[model samples]
Target: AVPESHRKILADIADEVLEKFYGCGSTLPADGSLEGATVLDLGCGTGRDVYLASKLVGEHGKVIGVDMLDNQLEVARKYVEYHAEKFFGSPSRSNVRFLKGFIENLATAEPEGVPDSSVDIVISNCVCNLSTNKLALFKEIHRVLRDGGELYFSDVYADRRLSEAAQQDPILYGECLGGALYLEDFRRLVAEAGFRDVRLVSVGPVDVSDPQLRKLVPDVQFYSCTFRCFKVATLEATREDYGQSATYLGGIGEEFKLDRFFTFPREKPVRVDRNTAEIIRHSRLHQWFSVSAEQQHMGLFKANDSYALLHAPLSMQVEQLVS
Candidate 1:
């Protein structure tokens, strides 16, 4: 569920602006810790997330919405004054702004649009798939983010790479299906872009309505997944255990979910690897966690492989239980 503060802002937005967006999933961070942070919305069609982030950042913070289409941006810019007055009680004061530019090239798009290490967070909703050059897009995002900044976005991903024929099909491409990256490829690009660990926030199946669309790409699965990656410098290439542990301070709730496999419950100390400890200590959520000093090396972190469970047969699990 969305936070109450965000719900209030969503309700106040113009109906036209609300309905025009193409986001497949939520990109807003659930912790609601975005106060006074500068955020960028890449491929921000109609500025739905942009405006929502604007309100979340509060009066002191800034939210910049960037898009390639002028038609979408026209409607996006139309409500600046309305939100300014609604949020600040004055049309003269506005913390949200829109820029006309491609998601792939932030610097050359408008020349003065985004500077290196200028933003604290970069968020996108269902837009990463639309980019013709995803590497460039991720690279640009990496360049714009300050150290400890986060790239949280929702995007469509294919279980396997799309066939060349499927990619060429205009209808499939137009429907946000063709350009979807394979799951492994997405990770590779993010890592190449300088992010060490990428965490899955949430994921759900994406259905193809048209029978023909399904027929064209048989046995392929499409999913809408939201991911969070940090720009931390201390992150390692693999999970390294230095015997570090972390305890949650219980501000948000009973627990905090760091990723799909790891959740830190309140007041309870959980053993963590060096990367996990560094991530929590370095990222914006540092205040909410208490990370102990690193101990001696303990070889590889002996964590359960959740993906192995997904791939193995149910009988295998049953056998383990019987054993």
Candidate 2:
């Protein structure tokens, strides 16, 4: 998703670069930890996400924008030097490249190829739904990320599965509906890809304004969702209680925004389980929290306690105010 705070960063990108952006949600790194990380952008149409990623990852970082569509890559390739210069203040693109590749046909990870465990994160923007082979797409996503890296992306999903007849329409597919999956099926795909913990960052309903398309699918509803899955194989399928507690230290700023669960109410102790505790401790977000020392394992953490804390609206006052 192109946050309003970030569109200003896009001011330097060429108009042609912005014109082809078709993403649906904010998949941009919110943790402020991308600096110097190696990243891959799948289906980076016209380099909108790639150029913005260049800014997030900074000069020391590198971003590879891969798309198979000739016109998409053409516009993206034509502006690599220009986009880099905008971020680095010189005509140099040592950090970004546009490559010929399809999301569904990712290069198998090998040291000489896309390489296993090569990148810190793999991001996509409203492109996963465009793939006819999503299983292969995510299998490739899992293979490309480092052991502790993440998969952050945005795409549309339907509450109900779309009809097979809808799958072949160019207009419906182009609108990100034809290839969309039911929410549960998308979860299954993530599990099938070997990702253990999946978190949704943000989601909102998508309105289909095409009169015929609306009339054609009266039983369906769509949403734009941004999802994140950790490559951590150590996490358990079920959360186990560990008597863990988390409190914000007010350091990482707004980009560390995860969800209502992380929205600390000014250093108040928020109980979490072993899984949640480990996720924070393992990621770059460790420093921002004051976690309790490990204690004996208990049964499952009270889902109610966690849900109760999330019952109120979440805010990022400290993060936004400080950063």
Candidate 3:
């Protein structure tokens, strides 16, 4: 979630897009220039985020959306032409495509699930909780993404595991409850699927509104949490060093949120880790940061240097950045 000062590009999204969107926190990736990247939207119901992605990527980038429901896909397809002319400003600007498939078994999905290591970014809305095989979904995401690619998604989570009876309820299932992963399990599962340090970005509690549901999982409470995980092959592989600094050159600064120590393409250069610099070296942020010519890793988990990491007013800087 960006700060209030950030410019919002998705403001022109269609009314039907809002009507059908049931996602939690705004999972739209930071409004960096996405001109040549390929972005994937999982369970992109009615193409709300699909159309939004198309608008940001301009004419060259590609956006692919996948969903299990044909009727919903139809709704998404119906508005493509309208959005092309109305939002992107021309038919030539159109670069969005939609597909039908299950999220869990992407390797075998028809019209073919996305190719291995083909995507630059993957965004899923409130829907990941709806998948019965959540681990497989995470694995497919890992498989489809290029190294350094990010997985940005929002979904429901529970404080504790639900009872078998609660798991069997279709009503609960449809509400993102029956399939909700316990938060600790989610941390372990994503790590097993090759994503480590699944840092939570934001969280808000959700009530079991239905009376019967309240009684069914009485000890459990649900939360809508957003996460941003990445596939960085060499990240944190060794000890870290006070080796590098990052300066936001003030690129993408127009209405970019948290501009000071918080804003991207930073105005001030601050020392960063081998891992952080490596992440930026292979990412869009490369254009924003000014750093050493080559990243040299001398240590690991510099985060443990709580004295330096959380020294002052910016103790939660990284959390805010990802959030």
Instruction: Using lDDT, give the best candidate's number.
Output: 1
TM-score of 2: 0.83
In terms of lDDT, the poorest run of 10 residues in model 3 is 310-319
lDDT tens per residue, model 2, 197-311: 6666777678788788876567787777677787776777666677888777765463345653455544677777676677777755576777787799887667544543332
Alpha-carbon shift of residue 304 in model 1 (angstroms): 5.9
* Per-model lDDT: 0.79, 0.71, 0.69
Q: Candidate 3, TM-score vs. the true structure?
A: 0.79
How well does candidate 3 match the true structure, expressed as C-alpha RMSD? 4.8
Give TM-scores for every candidate, taking all chains together and pairing residue i with residue i.
0.88, 0.83, 0.79
Ranking by TM-score: 1, 2, 3
Give one digit per residue, the lDDT tens place, for model 1 in 1-323: 56665677789988898888765425677535687889998878888888887777889899998888888899998899988898789998989888888888888665256999988889887776666888888989999998888998888887788899899888988878889888778778889999877767777678887888888789887777777888999898777778888998877667888776678888988887788898888877787899999989987776545535323332232233223
Which residue pairs show backbone clashes in model 2? 1-25, 1-26, 1-27, 30-255
**Pairs clashing in candidate 1?**
none
